[PDB]
Amino acid sequence: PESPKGPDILVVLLSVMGAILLIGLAALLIWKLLITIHDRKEF
């Protein structure tokens, strides 16, 4: 409405950017969990 406002370039860029950060972390933790598992040693 002249103010299509709903820019959400910022919200979408942020939302898209958010998604990247959240998945990256899941990947980092999963890598760590598997690393722990390859090298057992838990007597």
Account of the protein in words:
Belongs to the integrin beta chain family. The protein is mainly α and 43 residues long. Helix content is 70%, strand content 0%. It is rod-shaped, with a radius of gyration of 19 Å. The N and C termini lie far apart (67 Å).
| SSE arrangement, N to C | H
Portion of residues in beta strands equals: under 5%
The N- to C-terminal Cα distance equals: 67 Å
Number of strands: 0
CATH topology: Single alpha-helices involved in coiled-coils or other helix-helix interfaces
Number of domains: 1
PDB class: cell adhesion
Keywords: transmembrane helix, Alternative splicing, Cell adhesion, Disease mutation, Glycoprotein, Host-virus interaction, Integrin, Phosphoprotein, Polymorphism, Receptor
Assembly: monomeric
Entry title: Bicelle-embedded integrin beta3 transmembrane segment
List keywords for this structure.
1 helix, Single alpha-helices involved in coiled-coils or other helix-helix interfaces, mainly alpha, rod-shaped, 43 residues
Produce the secondary structure layout.
Elements lengths: L8 H30 L5
In short:
With 43 residues, this protein is mainly alpha-helical. It has a single domain (1-43), classed as Up-down Bundle (Single alpha-helices involved in coiled-coils or other helix-helix interfaces), CATH 1.20.5.100.
